[PDB]
């Protein structure tokens, strides 16, 4: 009947493919030449279960001067995509230390969905050979399964923008998380 | 180049813009770059251009739009939202609509401007929250609230994009909700509000025949009718109640029908599908009555169907049960009084019951305790029934709703003592009895002859008498402390005895013997004389001045307040009935006035009234 508008914000460390993920959702065409540093001011139509939802997609960066304005994008957020890389293990241990407390500081009681990018790159040989120079290995999916549990993520998934695998299901899970009404209030003052 | 570009666009000059496109192409700098955007609020070139312009023809907009198109960033640029707090979410389309220029609205919509963008800045929030203007946080709602029928008509039906009228903002308010929110009781505002409301409702019904726009509810659960009733906006409320549509195609959504005319007598059939609800959903009547701080509650109560519905409801069952209520309560109070009188002081409570009189005596205590428990249960059920009304509902008004709670406590509290604290249960039992006897004016509220008396005594007691008693207590404390200090005994017991003597004097009886023992008797008598003069002569009967003025206000508004109190008591009595019985007592008919679009019968509950007119010739 009437589409419901929901706010989705994607946050992740640099070069993780957040912009690529949203772009592939947008036009279903991987940009192989030019990728904007941020993809902003876009609303996409999605239907999951008898409901029509307009999802407003916001991106956050910190490459240059975007960290100062990043806080402005948090308020009135309905769902968060905590995004990281499977080909870059360093993208994992930084999620709890610095990103999570900021997320809870600005926008608490908001559903958070964990996502790892570059599923194919975890099985690549050149990436493994280069990474072994520093005694490192690709991110283990089971480690992600557990890491979702630790940070209380609503759900954790994998995406591959190159082969458009799981993008639709991942963002559908994001939307179903968003439509959820949450649980009242906790320890509400008298 | 932000300052130079801002100055050029503000001045409206078009020649200066020449050469910007080659510069952007060579430097590959987008028009949305942080440097171009104003740091203060993320403002961009387009909103600055639209804000200031000459006769609505800034003339710089098309050139900037073409430049953005060449850069390939038109979608991002046109609908770039403002950052910060005060003007968060504002876009170019909102500004174009506000400035009452149709041309720029058409241009922005055609070029791809978003039409569902929401403005959520604090400035756009309601008046009481901190925002000076509220319009539903939507473009179409903003146009409707600003009395721009042409803009609304164009925006609703456009070949490029359409703004569905059944669209809800974050608050849940739709276009009708916002239109009611800005509605005012002024003569000019009401006319355009009603006209726009009718136009928009008719358009929505015409485009979508299956769904009725008024059905949609906000997050609070209210509808435009209910919200208007709660906010005290009579101008739109009365029109909504008696809405009649002459059009045959969409006459189903009308709320007032014509039954028949015999000579000067005209009988018309109103609809009350949502005006009265038997617990199925919130009703306009309950919201209008129980809620506090309503600007025009008394005027809104005096409408054609409300009075007749209250009269019929009172006649059908209200009178039958009201007297039953009075009789039962008075009988219970008499039983309680008899139990209290025949209380054996001798012996330690509890007492053994062996004699014939014990049969009768125990029953009184059992009945009183069960009645108190029933009162407590009724008063918790009622509190939860109204979705837990706050302090304002209980303390300020409807004092009797709180008093029976106190009566509920003491009566059971004594019982506990009667089991263990045997010695001093009478002390609180007697006070409970006194309070119960004194709080029977709730039943007198209903009577027309004595309806005002209870309301006005409750009103004057807490407001006038206490305000006067503050000053009286200042005087009392000062004078009593002075007199106690002055006297020479040659101490708590002496002070208490002196206070007792002084109070007995204050009544107007007793004797003035204290002066004999004290030193400086002359000043003591002077101070007593000042005390008596001030209090008795001036204050005691100058309170009567504003007391009589209060009773004068009540006399001037006696008819209006009695109607409210009678409605309150009858609704009160009704709400305690079970749901099935209430449905069995439904009022109205099931007239099938009209058929739906597909021909199915509406079969909606209604209620018919009649009046007389002699000039309809
Ligand atoms: C049973 C129906 C036919 C009528 C119903 N009366 C009763 O249920 C009882 C009367 C009596 C008398 C003596 C002993 C036991 C009962 S049980 C009835 O009509 N009403 C009760 C609910 N009402 C209330 O609860 C108000 C409004 O919420 N609150 S109150 O001020 O605290 C009050 C007022 C009178 C009574 Cl009495 C009990 C209460 Cl807490 C309204 C009015
Ligand atoms: C004008 C009004 C609205 C304000 C005053 C409030 C009254 C409730 C005060 C005024 C004087 C007070 C009385 C002053 C002295 C006493 C004696 C005291 O007990 C005694 O008899 C003292 C003997 C002893 O303890 O040895 C009990 C309270 C009483 C009656 C006080 C109870 C409350 C009274 C009547
Ligand atoms: N092997 C592999 N590489 C990918 C895949 N998707 C993206 N990459 C790379 O990820 C990059 C994601 O772009 P982006 O997120 O903007 O990088 P960034 O430098 O981290 O951006 P920023 O957060 O500093 S502002 C793309 O440019 C692409 O080269 C994939 O599916 N498989």
PDB file of C-alpha atoms in Angstrom, chain B residues 151-243:
ATOM      1  CA  UNK B 151       0.699  23.144  -6.056  1.00  0.00           C
ATOM      2  CA  UNK B 152      -1.099  20.277  -4.317  1.00  0.00           C
ATOM      3  CA  UNK B 153      -3.099  19.471  -7.448  1.00  0.00           C
ATOM      4  CA  UNK B 154       0.012  19.438  -9.632  1.00  0.00           C
ATOM      5  CA  UNK B 155       2.087  17.415  -7.172  1.00  0.00           C
ATOM      6  CA  UNK B 156      -0.614  14.790  -6.623  1.00  0.00           C
ATOM      7  CA  UNK B 157      -0.953  14.105 -10.369  1.00  0.00           C
ATOM      8  CA  UNK B 158       2.301  14.563 -12.286  1.00  0.00           C
ATOM      9  CA  UNK B 159       3.617  12.514 -15.231  1.00  0.00           C
ATOM     10  CA  UNK B 160       7.043  12.235 -13.559  1.00  0.00           C
ATOM     11  CA  UNK B 161       6.330  11.496  -9.887  1.00  0.00           C
ATOM     12  CA  UNK B 162       3.329  11.405  -7.566  1.00  0.00           C
ATOM     13  CA  UNK B 163       3.119  12.023  -3.818  1.00  0.00           C
ATOM     14  CA  UNK B 164       0.660   9.526  -2.359  1.00  0.00           C
ATOM     15  CA  UNK B 165      -1.651  11.201   0.146  1.00  0.00           C
ATOM     16  CA  UNK B 166      -1.594   8.149   2.444  1.00  0.00           C
ATOM     17  CA  UNK B 167       2.023   8.680   3.463  1.00  0.00           C
ATOM     18  CA  UNK B 168       3.166   8.892   7.083  1.00  0.00           C
ATOM     19  CA  UNK B 169       6.166  10.736   8.504  1.00  0.00           C
ATOM     20  CA  UNK B 170       8.274   9.620  11.467  1.00  0.00           C
ATOM     21  CA  UNK B 171       5.579  10.808  13.879  1.00  0.00           C
ATOM     22  CA  UNK B 172       3.015   8.842  11.863  1.00  0.00           C
ATOM     23  CA  UNK B 173       1.013  11.964  11.014  1.00  0.00           C
ATOM     24  CA  UNK B 174      -0.288  12.038   7.448  1.00  0.00           C
ATOM     25  CA  UNK B 175      -1.458  15.049   5.442  1.00  0.00           C
ATOM     26  CA  UNK B 176      -4.785  15.263   7.279  1.00  0.00           C
ATOM     27  CA  UNK B 177      -3.004  14.960  10.627  1.00  0.00           C
ATOM     28  CA  UNK B 178      -0.693  17.859   9.775  1.00  0.00           C
ATOM     29  CA  UNK B 179      -3.568  19.933   8.404  1.00  0.00           C
ATOM     30  CA  UNK B 180      -5.419  19.483  11.694  1.00  0.00           C
ATOM     31  CA  UNK B 181      -2.239  20.248  13.646  1.00  0.00           C
ATOM     32  CA  UNK B 182      -1.876  23.713  12.088  1.00  0.00           C
ATOM     33  CA  UNK B 183      -5.636  24.288  12.151  1.00  0.00           C
ATOM     34  CA  UNK B 184      -6.737  27.309  14.164  1.00  0.00           C
ATOM     35  CA  UNK B 185     -10.053  28.568  15.498  1.00  0.00           C
ATOM     36  CA  UNK B 186      -9.659  31.878  13.646  1.00  0.00           C
ATOM     37  CA  UNK B 187     -12.297  32.826  11.093  1.00  0.00           C
ATOM     38  CA  UNK B 188      -9.976  32.888   8.077  1.00  0.00           C
ATOM     39  CA  UNK B 189      -7.848  29.852   8.953  1.00  0.00           C
ATOM     40  CA  UNK B 190     -10.800  27.508   9.474  1.00  0.00           C
ATOM     41  CA  UNK B 191     -12.325  28.156   6.048  1.00  0.00           C
ATOM     42  CA  UNK B 192      -9.186  27.263   4.102  1.00  0.00           C
ATOM     43  CA  UNK B 193      -8.370  24.354   6.427  1.00  0.00           C
ATOM     44  CA  UNK B 194     -11.794  22.804   5.843  1.00  0.00           C
ATOM     45  CA  UNK B 195     -11.657  23.474   2.102  1.00  0.00           C
ATOM     46  CA  UNK B 196      -8.240  21.840   1.729  1.00  0.00           C
ATOM     47  CA  UNK B 197      -9.250  18.921   3.957  1.00  0.00           C
ATOM     48  CA  UNK B 198     -12.355  18.216   1.880  1.00  0.00           C
ATOM     49  CA  UNK B 199     -10.475  18.582  -1.406  1.00  0.00           C
ATOM     50  CA  UNK B 200      -7.688  16.226  -0.349  1.00  0.00           C
ATOM     51  CA  UNK B 201     -10.070  13.643   1.113  1.00  0.00           C
ATOM     52  CA  UNK B 202     -12.173  13.652  -2.054  1.00  0.00           C
ATOM     53  CA  UNK B 203      -9.083  13.269  -4.243  1.00  0.00           C
ATOM     54  CA  UNK B 204      -7.774  10.380  -2.143  1.00  0.00           C
ATOM     55  CA  UNK B 205     -11.142   8.612  -2.203  1.00  0.00           C
ATOM     56  CA  UNK B 206     -11.480   9.150  -5.956  1.00  0.00           C
ATOM     57  CA  UNK B 207      -8.027   7.768  -6.736  1.00  0.00           C
ATOM     58  CA  UNK B 208      -8.255   4.859  -4.259  1.00  0.00           C
ATOM     59  CA  UNK B 209     -11.879   3.733  -3.741  1.00  0.00           C
ATOM     60  CA  UNK B 210     -11.036   0.697  -1.593  1.00  0.00           C
ATOM     61  CA  UNK B 211      -9.262   2.496   1.266  1.00  0.00           C
ATOM     62  CA  UNK B 212     -10.516   5.470   3.281  1.00  0.00           C
ATOM     63  CA  UNK B 213      -7.855   8.036   4.140  1.00  0.00           C
ATOM     64  CA  UNK B 214      -9.231   8.877   7.590  1.00  0.00           C
ATOM     65  CA  UNK B 215      -8.759   5.236   8.617  1.00  0.00           C
ATOM     66  CA  UNK B 216      -4.982   5.648   8.875  1.00  0.00           C
ATOM     67  CA  UNK B 217      -3.709   6.184  12.416  1.00  0.00           C
ATOM     68  CA  UNK B 218      -0.529   7.773  13.726  1.00  0.00           C
ATOM     69  CA  UNK B 219       1.954   6.261  16.169  1.00  0.00           C
ATOM     70  CA  UNK B 220      -0.114   7.597  19.075  1.00  0.00           C
ATOM     71  CA  UNK B 221      -3.060   5.636  17.645  1.00  0.00           C
ATOM     72  CA  UNK B 222      -5.275   8.684  17.088  1.00  0.00           C
ATOM     73  CA  UNK B 223      -7.136   9.668  13.928  1.00  0.00           C
ATOM     74  CA  UNK B 224      -7.684  13.183  12.548  1.00  0.00           C
ATOM     75  CA  UNK B 225     -11.077  13.361  14.252  1.00  0.00           C
ATOM     76  CA  UNK B 226      -9.678  12.077  17.546  1.00  0.00           C
ATOM     77  CA  UNK B 227      -6.620  14.330  17.326  1.00  0.00           C
ATOM     78  CA  UNK B 228      -8.805  17.365  16.631  1.00  0.00           C
ATOM     79  CA  UNK B 229     -10.974  16.453  19.618  1.00  0.00           C
ATOM     80  CA  UNK B 230      -7.928  16.009  21.855  1.00  0.00           C
ATOM     81  CA  UNK B 231      -6.290  19.258  20.713  1.00  0.00           C
ATOM     82  CA  UNK B 232      -9.452  21.320  21.185  1.00  0.00           C
ATOM     83  CA  UNK B 233      -9.794  22.537  17.582  1.00  0.00           C
ATOM     84  CA  UNK B 234     -13.561  22.954  17.272  1.00  0.00           C
ATOM     85  CA  UNK B 235     -13.465  24.591  13.845  1.00  0.00           C
ATOM     86  CA  UNK B 236     -12.430  21.459  11.971  1.00  0.00           C
ATOM     87  CA  UNK B 237     -14.055  19.071  14.463  1.00  0.00           C
ATOM     88  CA  UNK B 238     -17.607  20.332  13.983  1.00  0.00           C
ATOM     89  CA  UNK B 239     -17.194  20.286  10.201  1.00  0.00           C
ATOM     90  CA  UNK B 240     -15.887  16.711  10.282  1.00  0.00           C
ATOM     91  CA  UNK B 241     -18.801  15.575  12.444  1.00  0.00           C
ATOM     92  CA  UNK B 242     -21.435  16.913  10.023  1.00  0.00           C
ATOM     93  CA  UNK B 243     -19.627  16.180   6.758  1.00  0.00           C
TER      94      UNK B 243
END
